[PDB]
Scaffold this active site. Structure first.
Site, PDB file in Angstrom:
ATOM      1  N   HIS A 109       6.677   5.299   4.445  1.00 45.85           N
ATOM      2  CA  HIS A 109       6.838   6.212   3.312  1.00 45.85           C
ATOM      3  C   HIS A 109       5.537   6.409   2.546  1.00 45.85           C
ATOM      4  CE1 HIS A 109       8.539   8.308  -0.059  1.00 45.85           C
ATOM      5  NE2 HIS A 109       8.277   7.327  -0.901  1.00 45.85           N
TER       6      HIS A 109
ATOM      7  N   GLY B  21      -1.133   2.231  -2.076  1.00 50.62           N
ATOM      8  CA  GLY B  21      -1.998   2.635  -3.176  1.00 50.62           C
ATOM      9  C   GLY B  21      -2.591   4.013  -3.000  1.00 50.62           C
TER      10      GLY B  21
ATOM     11  N   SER C  13       3.274   2.220   2.546  1.00 51.90           N
ATOM     12  CA  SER C  13       2.486   3.434   2.325  1.00 51.90           C
ATOM     13  C   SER C  13       1.114   3.325   2.972  1.00 51.90           C
ATOM     14  CB  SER C  13       2.382   3.762   0.821  1.00 51.90           C
ATOM     15  OG  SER C  13       1.361   4.729   0.557  1.00 51.90           O
ATOM     16  N   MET C  14       0.062   3.331   2.148  1.00 53.19           N
ATOM     17  CA  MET C  14      -1.302   3.331   2.643  1.00 53.19           C
ATOM     18  C   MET C  14      -1.680   2.017   3.350  1.00 53.19           C
ATOM     19  SD  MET C  14      -3.204   5.984   2.874  1.00 53.19           S
ATOM     20  CE  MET C  14      -2.033   6.774   1.772  1.00 53.19           C
TER      21      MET C  14
ATOM     22  N   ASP D 145      12.116   6.613   2.876  1.00 56.05           N
ATOM     23  CA  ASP D 145      11.938   5.185   2.669  1.00 56.05           C
ATOM     24  C   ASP D 145      12.657   4.360   3.715  1.00 56.05           C
ATOM     25  OD1 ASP D 145      11.026   3.834  -0.205  1.00 56.05           O
ATOM     26  OD2 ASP D 145      11.279   6.042  -0.215  1.00 56.05           O
TER      27      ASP D 145
END
Lengths: 175, 172, 173, 173, 171, 172, 172, 168, 173, 171, 173
Positions: free
Chosen positions: D113, D59, D88-89, D153
């Site tokens: 990623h 996010g 991600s985050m 990715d």
């Protein structure tokens, strides 16, 4: 998604194909599609009762009743209705494929065909018209009614060549 | 879509007069029915003259892609294919499907051969069929194409030529 | 969008097209790209020798779509003049600078921004350096300067755009 | 979310055991919620461990960072346990747990990623380098290796994630 | 969703008896709720069995694995009971219960078909699904690979034969 | 928001018991009237103990901003401000407005002093009022704060310390 | 649904305390899951005391219906079924499925055993499943049932007693 | 809106009523009830009405107005943020000596504009009531409520719409 | 819009455009500006000598969109007469004052308003300074007075607007 | 909304050929821009020939009503006004603004002079309408003020007597 | 609505070539505006020839109906009214309103005179009084009976509507 064509007169592409006696059934079959298809068949028979009609089929299927209207109109008119599957013919779409003139039902090499007839009406009348579908499918393919009763109850995806082997089409078209 | 008079068309309709077909969206059944119809139209006007299919497409339906594929192979005219912008998945398969020696891309155009993942087995079956046709049309081994269509790499126009997805990169 | 009839009917854009004039007055997406590319291909078949005029009032859009118009401008034989009226931002400013040398123009109160706003991250950065390399070639700026300026939001005056090498002339009233 | 008896829902009842679930995309509402739980748990006790379960697709950078800074600020150790996915985050928050106490279940997938488009470009790129530097510090990997990898990715197995230094141990049944 | 009274809703009252109802599609929300119920029950008692009832069309593989792993990690045996349907990821979780303690009611229906973001990763987690289904059922990986690619409903008795459940709960 | 039952609050109410107010959203009249209320409540429980205002806000209405601001200044208790995440526009004005020596940011917090753009004259009037209050509370000249509130640059926690918007960056 | 303090039950919660379950709508999986959970709940409290299942339902999902069915058959306590208003398709199957001697209808209740018509062959397989169970539970031959469940018959409470779908029509 | 009460409900305990919104009939019926509830508890102690409002319905504003005047307790009024239109009218309607504003609070007396005669008639009565409660001539309130003018807290005291600007 | 045939079928606006009449009848945004500019370009290609008539009934709109229209009025060769029917506000009144010298008109019951109401704050303020300067040049008023006046909303009567230098004449019945 | 062929029109375009403009809706900016354009067009074809404006309108925007009013008074040709059905507010004002002697209503038509409501500008433009109505009706300004603040339905004859129309058309 | 090439038409326009107008829907201002227009058009085309108005309508707005009514009575040529399907409320008032001797209905048509009950109650009751009054003249019934019957929702046969005096003839195959 429908370009215009002006001869020296403006047709969109389909109306220009209709000029050459080509009908494109490229969607799910409901009553609107049926009324349009039947109409085109009647128009083309009126233009010429001897000349072949070419019906192209790219259809997921649809309404049994609407499917039957097109069927009975194909059978009634004098002109030979060739059938050509270009992408998919499933359930009522494959039924219409198999209802093309004998010797004149085709598919492109990569077309998928499915004889699965899926499923407010009472259950006994749904089953009654199903029997009607199997009987008509049994004749137009040369398969026994027992074998078509089984096969239409499963979602078997046929290759163009399986369809030909099975008797739904006469030939697979070669480049 | 502007109007053009030589009797009035829109742009796409005037281009079709020069046998140009523009494939500029995701490929679903309506696009397929439409591309096929135009190709069929063009065939009957002249079975000898070249067709030019420009491609700017993120891809779409396998069944829709194949219906267009098959009409390209079936008709007598050579169908040229020109990639402008992007050709992804089934868009990249159609670009590679053009007449031999006549598949092009503009210099900044992009090509991704990744074919995204109703009974699983049916999907995987048609998937083997795409790899083989992509092997036949690129000259790459089936095993190489197996790996490559399962990964999301972007090819430059030049990489697409080195790969055999196109014949030429068009230069100004 | 008014109708124009020549004793033959067009809308204004269509009749402007008759004079080899193309209007790009919106955000660039796939639909606008295909429309513009087609107009360019059409105009090219009509006459490979006469200039084409591309008017640009655009806030920006898809890199992919923008590159399709870019490559088409370059591919065809005719000069494409570019004229910025209102605004050229982001991919809009890239296409303004994509016009034939000597023939990139802007009206006096027009505004240019080269800020390119930010698929795997790797590919986005890759196609960014490819934008930057091309803008450097078309403007005369070193790639290190284009690099810094495309990473910031930066309104250029029409005169500043000339000073930058985005346009060749500011059209005098 | 069922009721437990003083009537909690499951999360409230797990908070009693100093357990915080991060089970969604991270945005400002999620961030404020996570932060307030962490501040509430520090208030109850500053010595006892916290357990942050993570099943999250990623996010907002800023929201990720508000959680990150709050984990680092408070006195207690914050264990991190990846159930399902950390992307991600969410993977950044997984690697930010107390050293020695970053875990993943055997089948959990981790992906580092950091998306770009999912502000001026320059500022986004500034904070990207800061995320990379922090990931370097907490994995033991070079800032350069981490630059490459967070631009791409890759889904990492729990084992590969441990091999990477994103977690300390894979929990065995 | 009725209330029982100290005021609970039924599910919460069933939770007091260590019963968890998986009654829908599995998404991340459903997964987080389930995992939470397990962690809660485990803390409350590490030795006592847990009962997971399953009526699920399927869902997210990530979400399913989240539940799968938590089941395996905690100490209590987790009994799985299929009521109605277990399809796809729901059938995986059914098989995932403590061996000896996987059940279905007589008219329950089990489907192992696994429906089909980059292709290589999806095919990768498919093989990982297949290999676990192979372990938990006793069936060879080649057989599971074939069967999860085809859409086929199994009787409760057929699912017992297959190795997805241990018993059909006779009435 | 989870429940906490002591020997039932939602988290925010439990934090309010410690005199902790969470400003975690865009500032509109509704958010303003909630924040003002929590302030008057806490002044009334105890007029002597510090209050802790945490800020994660994109900004909001100038008027609603001022209602919170005027309330902070009017009550007896020292109101601490802590920026978590982001303080932009009116969020950063409120951050600068906490008790002198009691304005904080976590190390990765972001602060934007940009006040974005009723009759125009009155918008400009109340902006001069903002600028003059930022001038006092930061020690920076009215000239400078005008330039800076007219641009949209993001400030690091430490950069906001140097600016005089906060007193300390909080160390782990 | 209104409250009743007996600790605040809604009327359905109140009735559940007397082992009364109301099935008052179309049967989907949420309903099935609710009914199943209520059955399991009541079963835990007392495995000997009767349960009363009131049915006013237009029918619904076969799978959802079979889940309710299987739980009735599984649990120890006797489930009494009472048709108020209507029982159609899966509603009438669940009605016929109550404890022997303990299946009732109110005098003006309507009962319809038509089972309306995802591969076709699987649907037909499950219909046979229903027909056989209805056959075990009414005393009618599978052939009369397979005939009657294929058509739109509305049965009077009395006629449904004739049929063996219910045991008694409830005297006022 | 945290918590057993929610904040506003806790403040009501202290005889504080918060008007933080546009004034319509839902808002009017809420305020009136709170005012009636508070006087039932004690008809002597002051009531505190905070005002942060863009204004709204005349009729709904007059319902609050009339309830304030009717009840025994002094109703202090305190403008935070803004009082516009009916909100400014309610501000000026607080007990005399007890109408306040925060230093950066904004006040606008413009009343923006069923047959036209009825609304022009009710508007005269507003003007007359503002003239009384400010000490300005009716002819001056006439001009002033017909244009859109923001007053400073200080400007509003000078005007007679408040008695005091609150000092921090 | 009703249809007129001369078999050449128009809508009234197309019929008017034949007589070199453009109607600016709405809020000015990008679509509108693109339309007017193209109509101005069309009419210019048709006859560069003959006058153009721009009827204005408009509440204002986008500044960019306003300037695109302004710049094209100034650039093309023909005299552009401006006629306010009903309302000219904000960018509507700016475009009204931008018509040919001696050829800016209002119908007697028309209302004109110069208030321009209130991307970084400083860019807005700088383009505001553009409008004010140009308003000063075209009205003969000092930049001081114009700044003062574009910051408040005063409605101007047809006569007041003549007084002010926004229009040249009020049109007599 | 049928098509007529002489050249193909809809009925309104066909009636425009006979210099007939139909004002049949609430007046807004689009309606006003349309009516004005028709009026301009018609004066271009012939500046001496009468124009016929039929009005069936519940009213509308004041700015828009004034744009049409002002265009009527500016152009040379006489603009006859005919009220069919209803003319209210700005509708009734545009009825009254037709050429003297040439303002009509059908026998069963309804006319309402009520004008509904920064306040100071609204009042000013309202004093502007009142003053024009008073001129065109021949009624005192004090009487217009009373009556436009009132919702008063006028018979066709009552509107004649009032001086809003000149005649009531006879069957 | 199919085309008709005689020059292209939809069916209604072709029928309008034979002075046939179709009232087929609920009457509102847009319907009335259309019908009135079609009537003025047919008068201008020929003021002595009969117009044929087919009515299949559940009725609608009183003001709209009276606009249609007044136009029938004003224009010179006879308007025959033919009820196909249904005429209710204002639809049935419009049916009564056709040329004496020339009001017709198909055999199975249904006619309802009930006139159902933002304006004041006083005005609604007064325009209702003229409805009653007008139906008394056109049918020959007393006003007392008309008042009664239009306050009740009874359905008439084509024949009962004839005996009532709302039509002249029931049409013969």
């Amino acid at each position: 998604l429908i370009p215009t064509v002006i001869e020296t007169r403006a047709y969109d592409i389909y109306s220009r194909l209709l000029k050459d006696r080509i009908i494109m059934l490229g969607s799910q079959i409901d009553d609107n599609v049926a009324n349009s298809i039947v109409s085109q068949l009647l128009f083309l028979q009126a233009q010429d009762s001897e000349k072949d009609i070419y019906l192209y089929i790219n259809s997921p299927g649809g309404s049994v009743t609407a499917g039957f209207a097109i069927y009975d109109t194909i059978q009634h008119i004098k002109p030979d209705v060739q059938t050509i599957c270009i992408g998919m013919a499933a359930s009522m779409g494959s039924f219409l494929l198999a209802a093309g003139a004998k010797g004149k039902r085709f598919a492109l090499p990569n077309a998928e065909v499915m004889i699965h007839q899926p499923l407010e009406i009472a259950a006994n009348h749904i089953l009654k018209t199903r029997e009607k579908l199997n009987r008509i499918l049994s004749e137009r393919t040369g398969q026994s009614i027992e074998k078509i009763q089984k096969d239409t109850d499963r979602d078997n995806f046929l290759t163009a060549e399986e369809a030909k082997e099975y008797g739904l089409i006469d030939e697979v078209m070669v480049p």
